[PDB]
Design a protein around this ligand. Structure first.
Ligand SMILES: CNC(=O)c1[nH]c(C)c2c1CCCCC2=O
Length: 127
C-alpha cells in the first residue's frame, strides 16, 4: 500500500551524449504529449496512497511516468532514443496491465499513445 521511491533520474556515472534523436524526443514527442488534455494522470508517479490503490505496486514493478521521462531528457540519462522510447512504452503498458478496458485512464493512455506512435514514426535519421 506504500509508494516506492521514484525511478532514478540522475546518475553522474552513466555516460551521456546530446543527439538529434534525443532532442526530437524532448522537443517534439514529450512536449506534444505533455500539453495534451489527457496528460495530467501521467505527469508524475502514481501516488498509490492518495489515489487509494493499495495493490498498484503489487502489480506494477517498473513504474514510469512522463514526469520521470521529462527529467531524464533534461538530465541526458538515455544514451540513445530507444531507451527513452522504452520508458514511454512501459508507461502505457503499465496502464493497460493494471486497469480495465474502457476505464477513463485507459482511454487517456490510448489517445496519448496514438500521438506518440505517430511522432516516433517520424523519428529523424541520426546525424
Ligand atoms: C493523478 N494520477 C492518476 O489519477 C492516475 N494516473 C495513472 C497512470 C493511474 C491513475 C489513477 C487511475 C487508475 C490507476 C492509473 O493507472
Amino acid at each position: 500500500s506504500m509508494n516506492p521511491p521514484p525511478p532514478e533520474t540522475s546518475n553522474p556515472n552513466k555516460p551521456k551524449r546530446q543527439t538529434n534523436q534525443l532532442q526530437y524526443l524532448l522537443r517534439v514527442v514529450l512536449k506534444t504529449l505533455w500539453k495534451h488534455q489527457f496528460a495530467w494522470p501521467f505527469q508524475q508517479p502514481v501516488d498509490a496512497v492518495k489515489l487509494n490503490l493499495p495493490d498498484y505496486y503489487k502489480i506494477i514493478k517498473t513504474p514510469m511516468d512522463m514526469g520521470t521521462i521529462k527529467k531524464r531528457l533534461e538530465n541526458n540519462y538515455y544514451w540513445n532514443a530507444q531507451e527513452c522510447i522504452q520508458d514511454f512504452n512501459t508507461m502505457f503498458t503499465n496502464c493497460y496491465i493494471y486497469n480495465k478496458p474502457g476505464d477513463d485512464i485507459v482511454l487517456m493512455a490510448e489517445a496519448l499513445e496514438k500521438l506518440f506512435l505517430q511522432k516516433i514514426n517520424e523519428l529523424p535519421t541520426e546525424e
